[PDB]
Design an enzyme around this catalytic site. Structure first.
Site, mmCIF file in Angstrom:
data_model
loop_
_atom_site.group_PDB
_atom_site.id
_atom_site.type_symbol
_atom_site.label_atom_id
_atom_site.label_comp_id
_atom_site.label_asym_id
_atom_site.label_seq_id
_atom_site.Cartn_x
_atom_site.Cartn_y
_atom_site.Cartn_z
ATOM 1 N N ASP A 130 -0.182 -7.540 1.900
ATOM 2 C CA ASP A 130 0.347 -6.185 1.866
ATOM 3 C C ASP A 130 1.864 -6.178 2.037
ATOM 4 O O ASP A 130 2.382 -5.820 3.092
ATOM 5 C CB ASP A 130 -0.332 -5.344 2.947
ATOM 6 C CG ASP A 130 -0.021 -3.863 2.818
ATOM 7 O OD1 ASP A 130 0.471 -3.430 1.755
ATOM 8 O OD2 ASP A 130 -0.280 -3.131 3.790
ATOM 9 N N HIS A 170 0.812 -1.221 0.000
ATOM 10 C CA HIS A 170 0.000 0.000 0.000
ATOM 11 C C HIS A 170 0.848 1.274 0.000
ATOM 12 O O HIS A 170 0.323 2.382 -0.106
ATOM 13 C CB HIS A 170 -1.079 -0.013 1.115
ATOM 14 C CG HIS A 170 -0.628 0.505 2.449
ATOM 15 N ND1 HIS A 170 -0.423 -0.318 3.536
ATOM 16 C CD2 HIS A 170 -0.390 1.765 2.890
ATOM 17 C CE1 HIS A 170 -0.074 0.405 4.583
ATOM 18 N NE2 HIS A 170 -0.045 1.673 4.218
ATOM 19 N N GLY A 211 1.957 6.710 8.794
ATOM 20 C CA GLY A 211 3.317 7.209 8.674
ATOM 21 C C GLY A 211 4.315 6.128 9.041
ATOM 22 O O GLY A 211 5.497 6.236 8.713
ATOM 23 N N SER A 257 3.573 2.975 8.284
ATOM 24 C CA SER A 257 3.300 1.979 7.242
ATOM 25 C C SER A 257 4.546 1.477 6.521
ATOM 26 O O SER A 257 5.412 2.269 6.145
ATOM 27 C CB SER A 257 2.326 2.556 6.217
ATOM 28 O OG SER A 257 1.061 2.790 6.801
ATOM 29 N N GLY A 258 4.619 0.161 6.322
ATOM 30 C CA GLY A 258 5.756 -0.438 5.642
ATOM 31 C C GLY A 258 6.941 -0.711 6.555
ATOM 32 O O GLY A 258 7.877 -1.417 6.169
HETATM 33 C C1 LIG Z 1 -12.842 -4.150 3.853
HETATM 34 C C2 LIG Z 1 -11.532 -4.526 4.549
HETATM 35 N N1 LIG Z 1 -11.309 -5.800 4.472
HETATM 36 N N2 LIG Z 1 -10.746 -3.631 5.130
HETATM 37 C C3 LIG Z 1 -10.917 -2.162 4.958
HETATM 38 C C4 LIG Z 1 -9.567 -1.512 4.534
HETATM 39 C C5 LIG Z 1 -8.497 -1.900 5.579
HETATM 40 O O1 LIG Z 1 -7.316 -1.226 5.190
HETATM 41 C C6 LIG Z 1 -7.107 0.132 5.507
HETATM 42 C C7 LIG Z 1 -6.233 0.845 4.651
HETATM 43 C C8 LIG Z 1 -5.966 2.185 4.922
HETATM 44 C C9 LIG Z 1 -6.554 2.845 6.010
HETATM 45 C C10 LIG Z 1 -6.155 4.303 6.204
HETATM 46 C C11 LIG Z 1 -5.777 4.648 7.687
HETATM 47 C C12 LIG Z 1 -4.507 3.949 8.197
HETATM 48 C C13 LIG Z 1 -3.361 3.741 7.423
HETATM 49 C C14 LIG Z 1 -2.248 3.074 7.960
HETATM 50 C C15 LIG Z 1 -2.272 2.609 9.286
HETATM 51 C C16 LIG Z 1 -1.157 1.946 9.842
HETATM 52 C C17 LIG Z 1 -1.207 1.499 11.170
HETATM 53 C C18 LIG Z 1 -2.368 1.690 11.955
HETATM 54 C C19 LIG Z 1 -2.460 1.174 13.372
HETATM 55 N N3 LIG Z 1 -3.377 1.692 14.118
HETATM 56 N N4 LIG Z 1 -1.628 0.274 13.742
HETATM 57 C C20 LIG Z 1 -3.485 2.357 11.399
HETATM 58 C C21 LIG Z 1 -3.441 2.814 10.061
HETATM 59 C C22 LIG Z 1 -4.543 3.467 9.499
HETATM 60 C C23 LIG Z 1 -7.219 5.204 5.609
HETATM 61 O O2 LIG Z 1 -7.986 5.852 6.360
HETATM 62 O O3 LIG Z 1 -7.247 5.284 4.350
HETATM 63 C C24 LIG Z 1 -7.424 2.156 6.870
HETATM 64 C C25 LIG Z 1 -7.699 0.791 6.633
HETATM 65 C C26 LIG Z 1 -8.297 -3.435 5.484
HETATM 66 C C27 LIG Z 1 -9.623 -4.051 6.012
#
Ligand SMILES: CC(=N)N1CCC(Oc2ccc([C@H](Cc3ccc4ccc(C(=N)N)cc4c3)C(=O)O)cc2)CC1
Ligand SMILES: [Ca+2]
Length: 223
Positions: A84, A40, A175, A177-178
């Site tokens: 991912d 991602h 931030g 991420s990865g």
């Molecule tokens: C339908 C389904 N299966 N899903 C929904 C999407 C989900 O993946 C995601 C993908 C991206 C997002 C971001 C927010 C985000 C991005 C990176 C993150 C990294 C770490 C953490 C954490 N709290 N450890 C929280 C995060 C939250 C955003 O607001 O765009 C949130 C969920 C996987 C699960």
């Protein structure tokens, strides 16, 4: 990283910063020419920054190397974040030293309860925004699959695991991420996703690296 502590300059030598004019994701150096990060985090025109402590200050221990190729996992699903993981090849080999070192891949998966080290330059607030310039660290245990699946019904696959604290207060965040999740000296996870940051009953979700060792080795040897 929320509720963590300042790691200290170059104490996490395998940590990398992915930069496209600014830091956007973290990553882990697995050998002098390869970096593992989250799918991602895919972007075109990535520069890998190694030996970093403060991402806004050049302290003399850094190596900035452009990526020659990026390979996202063939089964990556952007909707569910299943698989991912992505591999990044550096244009030139990094010079490994005390401050820039590689992390080893697991020989086996880590069991629930195992304590791990998560690091990154992501947001440090559970509610609000505050991005640190220095690397933050957090010790967190791998949670049981039951607790993970109970928190995210129908969203956790066998290629993911939760780590952190159900009571909240400590967690990775946007931030980060990865970035790396190292347990027993091996790279066991990649910061993937979650619901908010450091919220009660919403632990972080990480890519289960032990499931991809074969794919990683075959891919890097063939590219
Ligand atoms: C339908 C389904 N299966 N899903 C929904 C999407 C989900 O993946 C995601 C993908 C991206 C997002 C971001 C927010 C985000 C991005 C990176 C993150 C990294 C770490 C953490 C954490 N709290 N450890 C929280 C995060 C939250 C955003 O607001 O765009 C949130 C969920 C996987 C699960
Ligand atoms: Ca710097």
């Amino acid at each position: 990283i929320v509720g963590g502590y300042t790691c200290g300059a170059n104490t996490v030598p395998y940590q990398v910063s992915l930069n496209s004019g600014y830091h956007f994701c973290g990553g882990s150096l697995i050998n002098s020419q390869w970096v593992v990060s989250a799918a991602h985090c895919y972007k075109s025109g990535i520069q890998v920054r190694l030996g970093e402590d403060n991402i806004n200050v050049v302290e003399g221990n850094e190596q900035f190397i452009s990526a020659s190729k990026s390979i996202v996992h063939p089964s990556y699903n952007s909707n569910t974040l299943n698989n991912d993981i992505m591999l990044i090849k550096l244009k030139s080999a990094a010079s490994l030293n005390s401050r820039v070192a590689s992390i080893s891949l697991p020989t086996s998966c880590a069991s629930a309860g195992t304590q791990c080290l998560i690091s990154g330059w992501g947001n440090t607030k559970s509610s609000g925004t505050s991005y640190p310039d220095v690397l933050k660290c957090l010790k967190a245990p791998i949670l049981s699959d039951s607790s993970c699946k109970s928190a995210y019904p129908g969203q956790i696959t066998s290629n993911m695991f939760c780590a952190g604290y159900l009571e909240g207060g400590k967690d990775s965040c946007q931030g980060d991420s990865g970035g790396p999740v190292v347990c027993s000296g091996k790279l066991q996870g990649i910061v993937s996703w979650g619901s908010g940051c450091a919220q009660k009953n919403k632990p972080g979700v990480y890519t289960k690296v032990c499931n991809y060792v074969s794919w990683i080795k075959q891919t890097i040897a063939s590219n």
